[PDB]
Swiss-Prot record, chain A:
Any one GO cellular component localisation term in the record: electron transfer flavoprotein complex
GO molecular function annotations of the record: electron transfer activity
Originating organism: Homo sapiens (Human)
Effect listed in the UniProt record for changing residue 125 to N: In GA2B; decreased protein stability
Residues bearing PTM N6-acetyllysine: 197, 207, 235, 245
Positions where N6-methyllysine occurs in the chain: 197
GO biological process terms held by the UniProt record: amino acid catabolic process; fatty acid beta-oxidation using acyl-CoA dehydrogenase; respiratory electron transport chain
Name listed for the protein in its UniProt record: Electron transfer flavoprotein subunit beta
Function: Heterodimeric electron transfer flavoprotein that accepts electrons from several mitochondrial dehydrogenases, including acyl-CoA dehydrogenases, glutaryl-CoA and sarcosine dehydrogenase. It transfers the electrons to the main mitochondrial respiratory chain via ETF-ubiquinone oxidoreductase. Required for normal mitochondrial fatty acid oxidation and normal amino acid metabolism. ETFB binds an AMP molecule that probably has a purely structural role.
Subcellular location as annotated: Mitochondrion matrix
Post-translational modifications: Methylated. Trimethylation at Lys-197 and Lys-200 may negatively regulate the activity in electron transfer from acyl-CoA dehydrogenases.
From Swiss-Prot, chain B:
Name of the coding gene: ETFA
Modification sites for Phosphoserine: 122
Record-listed Phosphothreonine modification sites: 75
Protein name: Electron transfer flavoprotein subunit alpha, mitochondrial
Organism: Homo sapiens (Human)
CDD domains noted in UniProt: ETF_alpha
Family under the similarity heading: Belongs to the ETF alpha-subunit/FixB family.
UniProt-annotated location(s): Mitochondrion matrix
A Pfam entry, by short name: ETF_alpha
Membrane among keywords: no
Entry GO terms, CC: electron transfer flavoprotein complex; mitochondrial matrix; mitochondrion
Sequence positions that bind FAD: 205, 230, 245-248, 263-268, 282, 300-301
GO molecular function, one term: electron transfer activity
PANTHER family for this protein: ELECTRON TRANSFER FLAVOPROTEIN ALPHA, ELECTRON TRANSFER FLAVOPROTEIN SUBUNIT ALPHA, MITOCHONDRIAL
């Protein structure tokens, strides 16, 4: 089997973001970036599938500007076989959404004859939780979203998914798309040997136009702003006082 | 003239409360509101929805093909409905059900969808959060169909009486059969459902054990509260994943949220920071949680929680 894993470069999770004074978006220049944590989980699962000798080849893909290559290099270090960078200029990378990414992924999925597309369930920046579902939709493939367990069953996938009440289990006919929940696995640390190795591995650069993907968008950011400010309230000395206060404001 | 289709969420012949908040969002658009009920048993849910305030038309799709609400099966149904009735807007609550379904529908309609909206400013303009609730993004959508999920906690529930919607059967669709639903494992308890609960008590890593978590159940019991958890509590095995609150878990905005032995990491704050009253119980006066808590006590949770529980037994 062949796997395509989509990995996104995003502002690092521990970062305090700053909104631009012009209100067009958040500051990203000079800010620490890293692989989206859900993407990392998707790469680790793809690699575990190879280690179980059920997957022959793992192809890592990132869509966006030059620095995505680092994100791809990271996936390669984690055990992906080769990379594709779908290059987009910085200005147009800002207009790049799930719709566009999903179109690219669907084209690559068909082009590279993949059996499974793995993604994170969401990107911690746009918080969309859309790409995997849309990719599946364009391909007419089944989707197993928010996966916490994946089991390959011949030409079929058994996926345990996180749902509001607990879990559920589905069986999908291959080819399929799966998006990874945080519970799925614990991504490995990429050792320096593995990183030096990954420098030998290949990255192909392509343009969305090369795939017949048009980037035109009918969505548009009007503005981006700070949410209301909320700072420290009051300290209470005793549990009795805490209960007293909550009762008098009518929350108990 | 806006015309909105709300996809009803239901399981076990019961309407999910989040669909009621979603109907409210839909009224912000000033037009006609329809609601589609697809499933294997739809009579009670449909009947119930025909009493919900704000709905003009209920459409009912009862078929065994909809067992487990597979989006591979529901999506053709929705596309068939849209083809017939040409809605300007299609929506659902941004639960797991809605997050799963709507972006696939948007793909098939070839439109960019919008997730987890917190406000409708106009038929084409929406507000949503990004970067784990740390920025508000206002989006304009020029798509022929606006496909969006709704943050349930941002809109009040539509009344369950006073409605008089019409009901009609929908277009049955042919089995796609590329996916199949096998089983489920639901966490069941006496507690109210986390996302609608008036009071939530949450435990993080400070509880040290799953056995210690019983302290929080006992407290919650006195408050008739739901119990949430941080990721650390889930990972350390204290509680099942479905009670996780935050960016990757459930978003909750209870009247009262009590954060017990939770530091207040960005990713946890994503899911509770719009709670009306925030209380922190934490031994670390530098815990970020204290920078959003209305009321805080810097003390050992093993003392405070049992005490609170005993006080609450009286009045
Ligand atoms: C992609 C991603 C998504 C994430 N999503 C979520 C999410 O949805 N929800 C979530 O919670 N986390 C999420 N996290 C993890 C998050 O970043 C934090 O690691 C987690 O929230 C920390 O949980 P905690 O507060 O319980 O642990 P800690 O940060 O270790 O806090 C423990 C607290 O317990 C207190 N304490 C210890 N003993 C006592 C005592 N005896 N009495 C009183 N207080 C005591 C300590 O002072 C401390 O503040 C996510 C992380 C990533 C990378
Ligand atoms: N620019 C991108 N390049 C590659 N993969 C992406 C990109 N954006 C999103 N994805 C994939 O889709 C998942 C969900 O993204 P989103 O739908 O934006 O929340 C991510 O974890 C990625 O695996």
């Amino acid at each position: 089997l062949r796997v395509l894993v989509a990995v996104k470069r995003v502002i690092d999770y521990a970062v305090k973001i700053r909104v631009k004074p012009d209100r067009t978006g958040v500051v990203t220049d000079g800010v620490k970036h890293s692989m989206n944590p859900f993407c990392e989980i998707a790469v680790e699962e793809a690699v575990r599938l190879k280690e179980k000798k059920l997957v022959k080849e793992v192809i890592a893909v990132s869509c966006g500007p030059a620095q995505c290559q680092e994100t791809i290099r990271t996936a390669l270090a984690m055990g992906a076989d080769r990379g594709i960078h779908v290059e987009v200029p910085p200005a147009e990378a800002e207009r790049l959404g799930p719709l566009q990414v999903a179109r690219v992924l669907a084209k690559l999925a068909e082009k590279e004859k993949v059996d499974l597309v793995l993604l994170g369930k969401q990107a911690i920046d746009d918080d969309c939780n859309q790409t995997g579902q849309m990719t599946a939709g364009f391909l007419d493939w089944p989707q197993g979203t928010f996966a916490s367990q994946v089991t390959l069953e011949g030409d079929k996938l058994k996926v345990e998914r996180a749902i509001d009440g607990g879990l559920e289990t589905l069986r999908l006919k291959l080819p399929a798309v799966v998006t990874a929940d945080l519970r799925l696995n614990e991504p490995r640390y990429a050792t320096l040997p593995n990183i030096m190795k990954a420098k030998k591995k290949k990255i192909e650069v392509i343009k969305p136009g090369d795939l017949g993907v048009d980037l035109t968008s009918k969505l548009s950011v009007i503005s981006v702003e700070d949410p209301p400010q909320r700072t420290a309230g009051v300290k209470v000395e005793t549990t009795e006082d805490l209960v007293a206060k909550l009762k008098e404001i009518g929350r108990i | 003239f806006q015309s909105t289709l709300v996809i009803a969420e239901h399981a076990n012949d019961s309407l999910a409360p989040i669909t009621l908040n979603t109907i409210t969002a839909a009224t912000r658009l000033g037009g006609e509101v329809s609601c589609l009920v697809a499933g294997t048993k739809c009579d009670k849910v449909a009947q119930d929805l025909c009493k919900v305030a704000g709905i003009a038309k209920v459409l009912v799709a009862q078929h065994d093909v909809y067992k487990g609400l597979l989006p591979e099966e529901l999506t053709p149904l929705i596309l068939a409905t849209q083809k017939q009735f040409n809605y300007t807007h299609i929506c659902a609550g941004a639960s797991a059900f809605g997050k799963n379904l709507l972006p696939r529908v948007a793909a098939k309609l070839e439109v960019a969808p919008i997730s987890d909206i917190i406000a409708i400013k106009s038929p084409d303009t929406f507000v949503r959060t990004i970067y784990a609730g740390n920025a508000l993004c206002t989006v304009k959508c020029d798509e022929k169909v606006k496909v969006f999920s709704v943050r349930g906690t941002s809109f009040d529930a539509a009344a369950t009486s006073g409605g008089s919607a019409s009901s009609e059967k929908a277009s049955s669709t042919s089995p796609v059969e590329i996916s199949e639903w096998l089983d489920q494992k639901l966490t069941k308890s006496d507690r109210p459902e986390l996302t609608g609960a008036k009071v939530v008590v949450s435990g993080g890593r400070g509880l040290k054990s799953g056995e210690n978590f019983k302290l929080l159940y006992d407290l919650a019991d006195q408050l008739h509260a739901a119990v949430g958890a941080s990721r650390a509590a889930v990972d350390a095995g204290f509680v099942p994943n479905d009670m996780q609150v935050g960016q990757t878990g459930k978003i909750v905005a209870p009247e009262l949220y009590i954060a017990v032995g939770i530091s207040g990491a960005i990713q946890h704050l994503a899911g509770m920071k719009d709670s009306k009253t925030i209380v922190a119980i934490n031994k670390d006066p530098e815990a970020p949680i204290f920078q959003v808590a209305d009321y805080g006590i810097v003390a050992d949770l093993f003392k405070v929680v049992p005490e609170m529980t005993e006080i609450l037994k009286k009045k």
